[PDB]
Write a protein that binds this ligand. Sequence first.
Ligand SMILES: [Mg+2]
Ligand SMILES: [Mg+2]
Ligand SMILES: [Mg+2]
Ligand SMILES: [Mg+2]
Ligand SMILES: [Mg+2]
Ligand SMILES: [Mg+2]
Ligand SMILES: [Mg+2]
Ligand SMILES: [Mg+2]
Ligand SMILES: [Mg+2]
Ligand SMILES: [Mg+2]
Ligand SMILES: [Mg+2]
Ligand SMILES: [Mg+2]
Lengths: 484, 485, 484, 485
Amino acid sequence: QLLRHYINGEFVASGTTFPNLSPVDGRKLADVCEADAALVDSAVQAAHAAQKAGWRDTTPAQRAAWLHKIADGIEARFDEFVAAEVADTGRPVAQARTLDIARGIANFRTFADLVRTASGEYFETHAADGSELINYVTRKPLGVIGIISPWNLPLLLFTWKVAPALAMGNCVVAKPSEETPSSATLLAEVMHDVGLPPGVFNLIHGHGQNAAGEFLTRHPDISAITFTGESRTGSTIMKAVADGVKEVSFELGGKNAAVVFADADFDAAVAGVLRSSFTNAGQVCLCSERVYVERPIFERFVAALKEQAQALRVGAPEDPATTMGPLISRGHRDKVLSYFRLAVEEGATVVTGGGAPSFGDARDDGAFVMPTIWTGLPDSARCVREEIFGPVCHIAPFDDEAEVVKRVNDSAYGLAASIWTTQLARGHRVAKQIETGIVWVNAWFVRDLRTPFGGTKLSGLGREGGRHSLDFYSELTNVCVRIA
Amino acid sequence: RQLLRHYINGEFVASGTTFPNLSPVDGRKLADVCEADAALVDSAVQAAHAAQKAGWRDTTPAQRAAWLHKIADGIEARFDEFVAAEVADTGRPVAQARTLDIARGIANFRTFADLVRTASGEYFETHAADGSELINYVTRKPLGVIGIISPWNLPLLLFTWKVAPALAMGNCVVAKPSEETPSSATLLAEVMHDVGLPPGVFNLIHGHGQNAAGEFLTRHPDISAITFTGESRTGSTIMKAVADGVKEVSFELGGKNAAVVFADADFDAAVAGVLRSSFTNAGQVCLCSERVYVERPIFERFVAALKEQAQALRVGAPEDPATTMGPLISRGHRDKVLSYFRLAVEEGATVVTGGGAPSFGDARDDGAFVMPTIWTGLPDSARCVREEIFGPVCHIAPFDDEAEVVKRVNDSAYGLAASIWTTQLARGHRVAKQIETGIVWVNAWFVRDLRTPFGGTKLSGLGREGGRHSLDFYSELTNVCVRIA
Amino acid sequence: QLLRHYINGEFVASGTTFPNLSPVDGRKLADVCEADAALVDSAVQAAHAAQKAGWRDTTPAQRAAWLHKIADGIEARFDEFVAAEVADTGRPVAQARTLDIARGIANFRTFADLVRTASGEYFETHAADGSELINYVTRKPLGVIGIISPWNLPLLLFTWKVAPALAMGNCVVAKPSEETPSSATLLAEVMHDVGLPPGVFNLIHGHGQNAAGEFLTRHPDISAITFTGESRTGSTIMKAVADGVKEVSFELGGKNAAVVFADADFDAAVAGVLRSSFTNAGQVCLCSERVYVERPIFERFVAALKEQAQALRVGAPEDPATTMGPLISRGHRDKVLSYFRLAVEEGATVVTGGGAPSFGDARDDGAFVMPTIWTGLPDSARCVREEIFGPVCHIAPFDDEAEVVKRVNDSAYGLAASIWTTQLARGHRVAKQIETGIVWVNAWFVRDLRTPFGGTKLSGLGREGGRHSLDFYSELTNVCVRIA
Amino acid sequence: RQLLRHYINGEFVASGTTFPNLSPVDGRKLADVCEADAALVDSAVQAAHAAQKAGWRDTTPAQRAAWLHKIADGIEARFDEFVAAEVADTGRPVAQARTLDIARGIANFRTFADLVRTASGEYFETHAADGSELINYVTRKPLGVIGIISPWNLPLLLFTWKVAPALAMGNCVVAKPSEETPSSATLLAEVMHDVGLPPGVFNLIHGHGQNAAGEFLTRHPDISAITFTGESRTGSTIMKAVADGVKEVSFELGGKNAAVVFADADFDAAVAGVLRSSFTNAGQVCLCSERVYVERPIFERFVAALKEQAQALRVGAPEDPATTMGPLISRGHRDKVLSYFRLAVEEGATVVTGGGAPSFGDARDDGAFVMPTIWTGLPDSARCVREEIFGPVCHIAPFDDEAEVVKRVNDSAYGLAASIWTTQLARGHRVAKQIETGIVWVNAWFVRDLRTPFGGTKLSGLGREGGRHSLDFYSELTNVCVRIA
Ligand SMILES: [Mg+2]
Ligand SMILES: [Mg+2]
Ligand SMILES: [Mg+2]
Ligand SMILES: [Mg+2]
Ligand SMILES: [Mg+2]
Ligand SMILES: [Mg+2]
Ligand SMILES: [Mg+2]
Ligand SMILES: [Mg+2]
Ligand SMILES: [Mg+2]
Ligand SMILES: [Mg+2]
Ligand SMILES: [Mg+2]
Ligand SMILES: [Mg+2]
């Protein structure tokens, strides 16, 4: 199998290639083409031309119909998409079916429905001099959107940017993670099979720094960059687009807290924190790596979570009993295991986990790590402040509400938080104080796609979802007409 | 000596070096201005951060709206002083400073006070796959500390355009006005002080930009956002400076704006309108029309009529009631403009009127005056019709058809604003919708409803301000998602 | 063929029947069942039960999916629906395809998309005493909607009320016009074939006063009545629901003006006024029966419209050359011909038309009338004030703008108006002065289904379209929760 | 003689018959009130219609907002007079008249002034089948003349709740206050006059309801709408009366509202809250809780605590600073309430406290006082727990589970409001969402954010007012659809 670029309506091979390797057993899955700067420029030019060749002038109804054809096209190959996603990431099959591919599909239908119903603002102005004017706000595409998408939830986070960009009449040059090329290449096959006009959607494969990703961010003819991934890489991109003052939309790192009050539903909160710590082997920007538990239930809470974490089954996705997969790569695992080392240096009590398992077969050539729980670290320790992006949480006691609010907000990140309580007043008054883009109460990672999603502080720039997506992927123009 | 001090944590404070504030009318020294170094800038940011936690963060919208109206009242109570400070710094004719600068400065505070008082939020119900139900609602809290760097061209107006929504949304502010125009911002600090706004909520720092107080502010790791109005090159520098902290940014940057006059336009209104859009504030507004396109059958008549009105302008000092155009901001800026005037001539321009400085024979010659200027004869590719000059000048070219002039207007790396003159219903709307700018006026110019989205496309900006766009920019949105079943 | 009621998931025959007769040649098309009060009560009870049996608790996603199944179901029988509509009304086939059945279908998809994207309002309250509350606005169904629909655009105006009522989770008891039963009965067959839960949609056939329509309006267990038809009948219904204070939504009569300024595009304005006067043989509440033309083009305008009106071909829909059909019935024709008589009594100049044609075959057993133009009547004449609802317009000269605005607004009706001008300022400043629910400039009967549609004065109560439909077919509840 | 006159077309005018205004505290005559016959009502409507065309129709939102703030200022300038008029008409304790009646009366004007100033509209683009393009925008103009019939229970508050949005949207008004409570509306007319509102924009007519001025107003063919707050039976009569003209209607009608107290509630807060929701204004608010349901484990303790607080109320005249509950509005209304008190006893109620009138031994006995009353022991089917009494009474019943009490609350032909007392997060939201009323409070009662939709379901109303709902009701929406290509 060879994974090719998709440029101006046709698949294209290129220069050097690199192998796509399984995080489960290290086996070679495919070769992947690597786009050089000339090839990236090729794609950007194809997208600019497709703008002028008529895509810019499609109606919202025409665009929504295209989005629904694409969504139909994914469904028709649903199992192919699942198998591709599982092979790239090692994600358990059941989770790939219901969280990854399904939500990938829902992204297209959601923005299709939103651009069909979307309207605009109208204002009447009565000027001091007695004149009268009308104002209305129109939208046109930015033009060409460059999309650099992350490896942790590959199809989901890719379609999350591609669907609204196309919905607002932009063309797209998209570069998926070098670790997870497969489902994006299948999406290109769908684009091709439904006959999207050539150059409207372009896929380029390759690496990031000094490679295709960078080239894309520095191209003078892109109109904006959308990015999900590490905060440091967000900063690099922000500098790269600066001279062209390009638009940017960032979803970056987090060091999210879960707070469990003594009045919580105890067994739901333990199950909830298990999910928010170890889903996708803790490789979700929304995962909870800090937990604060009110002191009277702190010891029992640690004990109960330890039991449930040790009952997880770490392994290959073809095993129906598997409930946590590997990390994305042995390189990422080296970074996570180095934090696990640092926790011991910082004096942590290792409640469970703290290393990689041993299988005694080809799974040892993969990238597995055990679910890990720490206690005993102060709020100042590097391991409770710095994002690890592995399956780990630290748990600490707290004594009162004003204290734990401050401890939650003590972070240079501000992506998400979850709070567990049964009390009406407490639930609302605590949630409104948390300096994050999202706060869940007695829940986690429930995503209504109409709501504003993004981060504060180091965790992001802008919001997506609903009208925030409509406004980001568009240029707003206020048309002000004198009528008297 | 008049000494213009910083305002930090509820008091005026000098610093260890100063620079002169000079009149653009006769070059005389008006004051000495303190210069904030990087340690003083950091002090202002920390005061702003402490003021957030000391309770400004927890004010209600009603409380904020009341503060903003008190501030508005305090400026009104000193209206003539504000006028005189603005006139002294900019040379702007008095009658215009009164009605466009200071009056709209006051209106910014009242407008955002009323918007925040009525603003509401969104609520969504979620029925999840597993049968559970959740409610979502979207809350806004302040970003925190907003850094505000404002330009010299409409000093009080554009300073308050940012300060008012920032304070309305419960942020604290560290604001650095232009080194050319410190005076009205300093009076604003006195008003803040006199109404007793809590210490640290509003901080004023004076100084220069590059390698000075402005730059220091943008690289500070504890600011939450930078709002900036000014040159596009400076926007790019700021964007890099905040990158490591991923700070929010809102930019209103350069433009090379066009006015389009169709043969079916109201001729007398379009000539007066283009006089206005070209020479208001001596052409020193980001929104000014430095390119004009006129449909060929009325082109010669249009050029001739505009020439006559432009030569009826009276260039001089603001104390003369007859003055209708003032100086440029500084002799340095005048040097840049007169260098473009020479470049237009090398590129083959016909000088219809103006093209140089007046000659007075007294101290007004020590100021920064230049004459209203009109060019013709340059191709769309010429530097003088592509590069922002930010002086009292327009180039006029003929066009033959509608599809053509739309292309010529959009052939620009800028995309701030445009104005179209026509009496035809279909034409007005269909042309306006194709223009790649943040704003398009039809039979008007620089009409600003503060509820509408204002900003630029391409090199001319990032984001929108006005109405809900200001409400959202100066706040962090939080979606609160609560399981109920 | 026998047209049956549809009650609680099954077709039901009833008591007496009446014939469905063609307006083209008088031939019998079918017998129609007639619902007595016990049968109407039967339907209302079935709808109330279906509310409690679970329809009230469907989600917006479930409802939208049902609406789309219904829309698919209509498309699958598109030609059957066209033939039924044409047979009932005599409408030309081409017009039945593109205006009637297509828009019937679009109504379902539109409200399906709107209830999927719809959201709600949230307000925070900071009370004087220092307390803090949140408010959010929820929607639940009214319950059971009684729908009485008109004969002029039968499927279109029926689905215009049925689609939003079902979208907001109501059950429906619907009574179509005794003149046009057929396409509504087919819609019931679609409801049945997709398996909508029993009692959610109920169809009752019969007449109005002292018959099924009245019975429905007086039932104590309906929650609201929606009605399109004559203003007098609106008043009767408003009185009938009064003791139960039921909700009402009315789209009633109009005496609409078209205004043509001398600066208009002359040939577009003549074509436009032909359309707005004689579409559906002038049997649309939106039709223009008054025209004001600026004096310098008044004589040429009358002459040009006369020529185009005489070029219309009045006849049976199976003739491909036919461009205007009959009136709905010989009874309605008697009322229209009595106004044509009154115009002569009032001193009108009859420019063209003024009577029924003669065919010399079975078409004389139908209900045809010729396109009719008058001049010479003062603003006070009954024939330019009272709604005729036939293919007629009166044309008058005017001299200035302020005059014609006043003459347009001089009416006890206020449904719609159209204005023809090429001038920017004039177009906007005149439109904003017109006391109607809708004003078109250089257009007529262009319906964006997201916009508010309804009348002022005698022409209506409420608006439908978009959020106005969402709010009408729902009960709003403000939930106010103290949190501190 | 004090004579209370109509206010029509900019002047006070008497009419040919009068009726006495009597105190509900001691029955003394306070004034004579003019009675408007059908010819005078028609005069007021024609004056209102002429004022529309004389230019009130063409005011801007800024102009209207300014009028509304002037009116608010004029009431404030006479605050103590308004208080004394309201107290004299209703017997309401002075401290409550000051903070709930007159203060909120003023706030209605300021609130709608700010809403209209910021309100905007919708814009839609249409791409039609034939390739043409159109723009749509939605404009609002006044309905025209609004007829306002207001109740006696919170006279100034509920009168201004309608007058302010009507005037804000550029309508003229013909308003008829209750024959029981004419005084504060007459002072409002004096304020209208003193600020110089144009003649015919605001008209006040006094008189009775059925076969009198109120009825005449509703049947007038030249009014555009009727807004009405009061009994459901009267709403039905009005609905028939406007039918021939298809007038707009907005109704806020009766209720038989419940308060629900779960065992997990904050006990002391819920007892105080139910005291409030039951006996505020002597139980004469449409929103009062006349049914209470308490979860069985705390039922007996709840009844006992409420009894003790109810017996600590002090029933008497408003000049006594110790008074905490006033009289009913009239001896006729008291007759209706005391007849329900007798009916409750026949239906088998246990009288926990109250059940009759106090006995003073002086002229207060000539007024309309009755004691706070609590019942238990009646089934859900009893007339005394189904029919609105509009006096200071509540019935309390036990319940055992959540699904049960939701059904009991919703078992009503009314559906105005409800309040729920619980400390549980999930319960608060899931119960509130099932209640079939226009409003549901959780741990609160009668908290009115004027931006939210306010109204009733079933027999309790038609339409919503508040925020955009008032903006839309008091305006005709016009969609303007313009072809541009
Ligand atoms: Mg790999
Ligand atoms: Mg549990
Ligand atoms: Mg945008
Ligand atoms: Mg200077
Ligand atoms: Mg932004
Ligand atoms: Mg924000
Ligand atoms: Mg028939
Ligand atoms: Mg033509
Ligand atoms: Mg409703
Ligand atoms: Mg009395
Ligand atoms: Mg209504
Ligand atoms: Mg309305």
